[PDB]
Design an enzyme around this catalytic site. Structure first.
Site, PDB file in Angstrom:
ATOM      1  N   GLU A  35       5.823  -9.764 -15.520  1.00  0.00           N
ATOM      2  CA  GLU A  35       5.338  -8.400 -15.235  1.00  0.00           C
ATOM      3  C   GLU A  35       4.993  -7.724 -16.329  1.00  0.00           C
ATOM      4  O   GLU A  35       3.957  -6.825 -16.205  1.00  0.00           O
ATOM      5  CB  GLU A  35       6.668  -7.733 -14.460  1.00  0.00           C
ATOM      6  CG  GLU A  35       6.867  -8.258 -13.349  1.00  0.00           C
ATOM      7  CD  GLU A  35       6.100  -7.699 -11.928  1.00  0.00           C
ATOM      8  OE1 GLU A  35       5.167  -7.104 -12.288  1.00  0.00           O
ATOM      9  OE2 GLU A  35       6.262  -8.228 -10.882  1.00  0.00           O
ATOM     10  N   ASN A  46      -2.000   0.644 -10.230  1.00  0.00           N
ATOM     11  CA  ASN A  46      -2.176  -0.112  -8.961  1.00  0.00           C
ATOM     12  C   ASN A  46      -3.462   0.293  -8.136  1.00  0.00           C
ATOM     13  O   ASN A  46      -3.667   1.635  -8.428  1.00  0.00           O
ATOM     14  CB  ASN A  46      -1.043  -0.046  -8.053  1.00  0.00           C
ATOM     15  CG  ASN A  46       0.464  -0.552  -8.640  1.00  0.00           C
ATOM     16  OD1 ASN A  46       1.160   0.235  -8.529  1.00  0.00           O
ATOM     17  ND2 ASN A  46       0.267  -1.824  -9.254  1.00  0.00           N
ATOM     18  N   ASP A  48      -3.524   1.300  -5.196  1.00  0.00           N
ATOM     19  CA  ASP A  48      -3.199   2.682  -4.395  1.00  0.00           C
ATOM     20  C   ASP A  48      -3.103   4.038  -5.066  1.00  0.00           C
ATOM     21  O   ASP A  48      -2.731   4.862  -4.543  1.00  0.00           O
ATOM     22  CB  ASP A  48      -2.087   2.377  -3.645  1.00  0.00           C
ATOM     23  CG  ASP A  48      -0.681   2.321  -4.396  1.00  0.00           C
ATOM     24  OD1 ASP A  48      -0.847   2.401  -5.393  1.00  0.00           O
ATOM     25  OD2 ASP A  48       0.541   2.044  -3.736  1.00  0.00           O
ATOM     26  N   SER A  50      -0.857   4.395  -7.462  1.00  0.00           N
ATOM     27  CA  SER A  50       0.607   4.421  -7.964  1.00  0.00           C
ATOM     28  C   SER A  50       0.373   3.561  -9.156  1.00  0.00           C
ATOM     29  O   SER A  50      -0.845   3.005  -9.630  1.00  0.00           O
ATOM     30  CB  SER A  50       1.665   3.811  -7.067  1.00  0.00           C
ATOM     31  OG  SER A  50       1.396   2.522  -6.937  1.00  0.00           O
ATOM     32  N   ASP A  52       2.867   1.167 -12.377  1.00  0.00           N
ATOM     33  CA  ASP A  52       4.125   0.399 -12.648  1.00  0.00           C
ATOM     34  C   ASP A  52       4.460   0.537 -14.154  1.00  0.00           C
ATOM     35  O   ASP A  52       3.626   0.479 -14.807  1.00  0.00           O
ATOM     36  CB  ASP A  52       3.938  -1.177 -12.397  1.00  0.00           C
ATOM     37  CG  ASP A  52       3.609  -1.600 -11.047  1.00  0.00           C
ATOM     38  OD1 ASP A  52       3.831  -0.645  -9.874  1.00  0.00           O
ATOM     39  OD2 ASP A  52       3.125  -2.652 -10.651  1.00  0.00           O
ATOM     40  N   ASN A  59       7.415   0.766  -9.830  1.00  0.00           N
ATOM     41  CA  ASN A  59       6.178   1.264  -9.010  1.00  0.00           C
ATOM     42  C   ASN A  59       6.631   2.791  -8.832  1.00  0.00           C
ATOM     43  O   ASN A  59       7.869   3.209  -8.400  1.00  0.00           O
ATOM     44  CB  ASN A  59       5.986   0.456  -7.841  1.00  0.00           C
ATOM     45  CG  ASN A  59       4.793   0.764  -7.308  1.00  0.00           C
ATOM     46  OD1 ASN A  59       4.089   1.917  -7.647  1.00  0.00           O
ATOM     47  ND2 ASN A  59       4.238   0.159  -6.230  1.00  0.00           N
TER      48      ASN A  59
END
Ligand code: NA
Length: 129
Positions: A35, A46, A48, A50, A52, A59
């Site tokens: 990650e 992301n 969308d 969003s 991280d 998220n």
């Protein structure tokens, strides 16, 4: 902060992640490697819209507030910036909520694709824990 592998293993164990919801410490260290590469300051947009945040790439769509993720929740009741700290307390507290949400560690797509079913114990090899 960029953690050492064994340094992160020790901090996660101290914060009660070893065998949390049945996930051995090697699972959490493996997830953190893929990650964040163990970098607390890691941020990734992301598709969308969003973002991280942190060692476990938590998220903004569900878990923290960053003020630029429309229709999003803050289920960990934290500013996303708090997930970038050299102290992993907020990330670990929030990860415990995520992993309890029903799909266990499959919530971390990098865990499902890179760690799940592998020799995760290798990630704590040679660590004094
Ligand atoms: Na949010």
């Amino acid at each position: 902060k960029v953690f050492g592998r064994c340094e992160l293993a020790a901090a996660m164990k101290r914060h009660g992640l070893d065998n949390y919801r049945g996930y051995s410490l090697g699972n959490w260290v493996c997830a953190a490697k893929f990650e964040s590469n163990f970098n607390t300051q890691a941020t990734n947009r992301n598709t969308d819209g969003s973002t991280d945040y942190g060692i476990l790439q938590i998220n903004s769509r569900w878990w923290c507030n960053d003020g630029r993720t429309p229709g999003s929740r803050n289920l960990c009741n934290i500013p996303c910036s708090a997930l970038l700290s050299s102290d992993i307390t907020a990330s670990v507290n929030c990860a415990k909520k995520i992993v309890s949400d029903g799909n266990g560690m499959n919530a971390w797509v990098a865990w499902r694709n890179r760690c799940k079913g592998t020799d995760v114990q290798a990630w704590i090899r040679g660590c004094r824990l």
